[PDB]
Assembly symmetry: C5
Homo-oligomer: 338 residues x 5
């Protein structure tokens, strides 16, 4: 039998096939099985609180009307223009902010049917998905980004999604992210939805992203460390050199404030304290304290007499030990905690 006639008798003019009717429509819900191949994963944005993926979405289900005996072949690969002629599930991504198909150089779609009427339907998609982030531990934070696959129009009595048993989420070999490690373990869950329109099938995959620390050492932690150390050289400068020691205090304090606002510049304007904020605040305190230390030195030594010059000199000699020591102690606590 010629393919033209076969497609005509199976799903075309002479078939009686109505794509507006689901498989087993008077019977139990259609069981759809899903798997995804992650071709690309990136544009993880803290500001807009979202991420981007390029995937192949695979859907599998049985349609008795598409069973065939005219060929011995276990399966038939069909031209994707035939997708418009068959019923298919109405899967959408519930947490999608943007989504598009791929049509270059032709529709990036695949359709395969089997002897028994099983269907395999694969389609390439780009998705911008929302990922609400908890930044309390930033930048030592780990985020969980989800992808929800839901039916828009079919209730659970007509249609049900399920992840495939074997390897439901594959990731392209050698895929890396500059800022994060994508963990190998992905959680699969149900997100069954209850709206005023009914109860809708929904399955979910959760990705765990661990933020890499290196960039923040170079950009943020080490530079701020050096500003703190800079403030300490004041303690070895002559107490008579007021403009020198005051310049050291001013510039370290001011640099520390811009350092602090710069540490948030790439983040959404959240109203809770983050781990980087604690660090910048304490660094700012230490640097401000060094200036206050000189104010005290300059003040107690006003009357240029031995007893008061000695009291001022003692403040300096203690500060040379205590500031670095207290800062080391804070460091122990900070790093151990996070």
């Amino acid at each position: 039998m010629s393919p033209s006639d076969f497609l005509d008798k199976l799903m075309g003019r002479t078939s009686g096939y109505d794509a507006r009717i689901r498989p087993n429509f008077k019977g139990p819900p259609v069981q759809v099985t899903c798997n995804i191949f992650i071709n690309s994963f990136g544009s993880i944005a803290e500001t807009t609180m979202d991420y981007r993926v390029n995937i192949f979405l695979r859907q599998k289900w049985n349609d008795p009307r598409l069973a065939y005996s005219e060929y011995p072949d276990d399966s038939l690969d069909l031209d994707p223009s035939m997708l418009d002629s068959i019923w298919k599930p109405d899967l959408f991504f519930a947490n999608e902010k943007g989504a598009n198909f791929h049509e270059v150089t032709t529709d990036n779609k695949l359709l395969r049917i089997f002897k028994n009427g099983n269907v395999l339907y694969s389609i390439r998609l780009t998705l911008t998905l929302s990922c609400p982030m908890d930044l309390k531990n930033f930048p030592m934070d780990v985020q969980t980004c989800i992808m929800q696959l839901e039916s828009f129009g079919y209730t659970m009595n007509d249609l049900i999604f399920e992840w495939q048993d074997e390897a439901p989420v594959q990731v392209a070999e050698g895929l890396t992210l500059p800022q994060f490690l994508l963990k190998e373990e992905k959680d699969l869950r149900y997100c069954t939805k209850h709206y005023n329109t009914g109860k809708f099938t929904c399955i979910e995959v959760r990705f765990h992203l661990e933020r890499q620390m290196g960039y923040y050492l170079i950009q943020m932690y080490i530079p701020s460390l050096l500003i703190v150390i800079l403030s300490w050289v004041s303690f070895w400068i002559n107490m008579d050199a007021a403009p020198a020691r005051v310049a050291l205090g001013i510039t370290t304090v001011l640099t520390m404030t811009t350092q602090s606002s710069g540490s948030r510049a790439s983040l959404p304007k959240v109203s809770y304290v983050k781990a980087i904020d604690i660090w910048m605040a304490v660094c700012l305190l230490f640097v401000f304290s060094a200036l206050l230390e000189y104010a005290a030195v300059n003040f107690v030594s006003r009357a240029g007499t031995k007893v008061f010059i000695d009291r001022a000199k003692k403040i300096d000699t203690i500060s040379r030990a205590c500031f670095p020591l207290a800062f080391l102690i804070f460091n122990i606590f900070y790093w151990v905690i996070y």
Copy 2:
């Protein structure tokens, strides 16, 4: 008893053999079609002060009766239909009057739902992304509360042909656990009419208002506390020796200059409005205090030119008063500022 095939049924109801004309409204010689609306807010964000707008992802639900779609061929109270049948039925021409951008969702198929009932009722739900305009009053920024609206209007049907109404029970649902980084979305939403009168006629319009309360925390960290520290910095001058002119002048210069950049930085993310905001008052007063500290030293340096006891003492008195009065005056200002805006 062989029930009628769906194909034949859809043919007889709204297809080739039905005589149904989607260009004609239900009860077209009779009273206006009563449409009932509800929305599910799936997502709510991109609240931008600069462009003065916000973004929502919603399911829009419309309900109305169409006698032509009543059926007796099945016992089922309702039928869920393939959304391709939406092109074959009449439906309202609802648009969003304050929408700047709007799109449907077509991945992996049209995000639309169509359900009809025995008596001819229709339920029509569609997923939409909308950028809606929200004119903001920033006088109290960043202790401001904004009201953002969404207007649902008929474009082509006058009130004698079509009427929108919010559903009685829970017209606006919000997805569980939905939060916004910068705002609190209040539980209470106002519903009202925005009936429109143009030179083309009178048009049905209903409105929902959301109340958004700006969260304070970010502004304490980014703006208020840093500026506070610059003011405190300026005060250390008063404990520095009056002989150290370059030290005390450096303190004055740098605090004044930092305060000016601090001030322009407090507006960088905002539209260029011509009224005074609450953050402006704060930055201006902080700038005044820091400038005053420098002027205080100018006075100290000037009155003590002649190095004589009486004039050195007068300069020293200016410093000892300043150590008490600047922090005291700044505390008083703080009391007034916070009490006025946050109480």
Copy 3:
């Protein structure tokens, strides 16, 4: 008569109506009357030199083929899908850079026909229109932004646009702009076009936008004023304090240069002098002059003798009066002029 049959006989299968033929095609030009409702008005950008509007565009004209007697109704409101079946004008916006229709939740279009064959056609549009700006007086400038409505394909012998007599341009109640005042008076005129393809109807509306001053006082004028005043404290500082008075000069001069570049950061890179440039330049001069004043004080007082110390002290006492006085005089002239 059923509406279906009526639409069939008027403009459908049995009508003989050809939408490719204009009303009175062998006769005089079609007279189209236009009015707009401005639903929204904003995104006024100096850099890209344009603005954005959301409007309802209303077009009115007579088509004898659409006259009816089958109903007593003065007018009929028709489903907008019938717009594809009737002739309509080919109005475009000549100074449009971007334009879109609105299709959510259905086409934002309105079609009404009258007994005598008049048509009312309204459509919702978003337009980005070009507005060439003259910034000589910025930020005390007033701009004129235009909207041109033109026929693309019909010459004046076939088609003519005209503004409606009564209230051709309506503006939504309570519409405001953050940076501008939109004046109540709008100029209407003709912009008849002559190309090498012929002569084309074109009507124009002009909006007057007056820039609000407040933002620039807060952001630009007052901050620069304070830098000038800052420079003057130098005159009350001891002439022996060289690093103090030189620091005052350096920092005010440098801040004034960044202040100056910052005043243009949001503007197109025009090559003429603006009002804000004059101000920043004079402020820069005053602040530079204060530093030069100290150079003179430091220089004439090198030899630490009474006669030369007195000459340096006289320079300071004059400067305390003359700088503020000269700056006040400049202010009088500047504000009075603009």
Copy 4:
């Protein structure tokens, strides 16, 4: 003859006209004549190396199948929906990065046919075209931006483009650009293309854009001039005031480095030296030299003896003359060269 019947017999159902066949398909190549009206010209971006135009593209050619005798009219203006029914050239813009039609409120297209079968086809387009820039003389540079009109699918034996003889490129009256002068003279030439698929007709227009100098005087040259002059006040300050004269050196050097990076901020990251780079480098040298001059003054005068104080004082008195003199000489050379 009714227009409906005429269009039917000319290019519709009863015509036998096949738009997939070119005019004179067994004969010589179709001669197409082109002219453009430039409605708008802007968004000249150095970073992305491109520019934007809004144009009316006019194409003219002869199609014997469209000749008519049924009307005395020299030409007929046809509804643009008839464009889908006729053959037309497949002109594309070879250096186009983005391009769109205009469809508000209807298709911005014009179709006119003449007794002898000539066709005039005009269409409105927005184009982003690539313009590779040579920035060696920036910002005293002149750029040449081109527009190439090419056939995609017809070789030279089937289709040939040619600019119109009379006024092939018209520009809207009063069109200006903020940063550039568009010269009146436009070069026309051939860009005939040879690919492995054959030989393709291609015509080119070249626009000459002269960058306006004013913005760069205000933003870049004059501010940097003032920093150089600032550095010179050091020479009149007391050699005993080390922190004052060193502060002058530091701040002018540092301001000059940010001034230098700021002069490139709006430009692509090219690896050759530009005219603004030469200027900033020399300004940086002069300002650095002034600081080195003080290092010498401070160093030679360490031993506080008359002979060495005098030597240091001589260095200052020479510097007061030579720095301004050498800087004037450099200015002469710089401006004269460019």
Copy 5:
């Protein structure tokens, strides 16, 4: 009388042909052999942040379809109107590493279709592609990157369809094409990237471009300015040890400028967590400048007691520093440039 084109197209691929575009050439036989070549019309927007690049190309595909063989004309080939592309079978080539892609439709579809006597087809189409290019920035900005383009079948397995680069000049580049930041090397690697998914085995061919980053911009913007800050720090060693505020100001400002210089060197880059070549340079420059300030702390400290022996010890620290800092910095430079501009 030769057959009219209308009738010919009708008999070849239209109404009377029996041609079904849903069936591949030789469908019961071996795989269709498709041959590909590209013309690169434009190549740019190489972004480190988004880790991608943009090309404008003509994609050429060649294959044989026996159903399209003709004898009705003596012409070796026929150039057909591209609307006929919808009527013929064609491969389903997609770009596997494409993030964005569009056709070109102004002023008509930028497509070409040519068929030959023996049924060969030539199909060319103009495309704009944003392709992903993962970058290794360890040696930035003396880095060389490899950007790839993968051409794959989406729906046909290797038993039905196979892609192959053309033998003669598979990748042509427009004459005079240059990139501001890079040199595109003349040699392009051609490779197979055959894909094995859970859906089967799919043909995939690959071209690799080598891009060498040009150094000049980084000398002007980054290396030389940082060099001058280091030299600035050295003038301190020739300034009087009594001038504490002068020498401390030199130390502060060079250190602070060096930190902003360092963050500015990464501002245009993705936030990678490894050390780059520019980072090493900025870090060492920062060390040198910090060391100069520490040198003065030592000078100021050892000379506290104003006695000849301790003033002399402080003076010796300065005279050594005048030689050793420039010498040590020269040595570092030798090592740095030799390492990166060789290995």
